[PDB]
Amino acid sequence: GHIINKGEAIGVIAAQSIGEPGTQLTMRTFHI
């Protein structure tokens, strides 16, 4: 819970977080 540490490779862990739930999105083309 503390602040991000020096050296943590935040670029990767950022990317992962976005790409994991991608399975739950509709890959057709929803139009609201």
Partner: protein
């Protein structure tokens, strides 16, 4: 028809010497159109709350395809309702512009009782049917 039910509107009834399109009639279709529009707005809005709960919970690999199947039916329909709302809005412009009740191809007038079933009707049966025939030939 649950459409006529949604509004507190009852099928109209053209009286003996009633002029064609009058104030009372456009007030009649406005209530139905807004209520129909208000009902459609609630369907697109509700649906999403269920839609947001399923996407948050992760299904088991086995039930991803079964869960997804119900999602696709909803999605397709919604875009049609968006089209329907846009058609209603387009029809709502015809009332304000005082050009409601007549065929768009030929000047012929569209039936009063015909408009109560589907207030968004744009053509008379002759032009509309002919259009559907051209369709099957120009498409396939």
């Amino acid at each position: 028809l649950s459409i006529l039910a949604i509004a507190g509107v009852e099928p109209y009834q053209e009286k003996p010497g009633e002029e064609y399109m009058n104030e009372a009639q456009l007030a009649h279709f406005r209530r139905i159109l807004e209520a129909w529009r208000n009902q459609l707005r609630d369907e697109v809005d509700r649906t999403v709350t269920h839609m947001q709960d399923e996407a948050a919970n992760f299904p088991d690999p086995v039930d991803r395809a079964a869960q997804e199947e119900e999602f696709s039916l909803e999605l397709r329909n919604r875009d049609r309702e968006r089209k329907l709302i846009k058609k209603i809005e387009k029809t709502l412009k015809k009332v304000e512009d005082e050009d409601f009740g007549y065929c768009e191809s030929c000047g012929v007038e569209i039936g009063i009782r015909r408009l109560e079933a589907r207030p968004t009707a744009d053509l008379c049966i002759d032009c509309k049917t002919l259009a559907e025939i051209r369709e099957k030939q120009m498409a396939g």
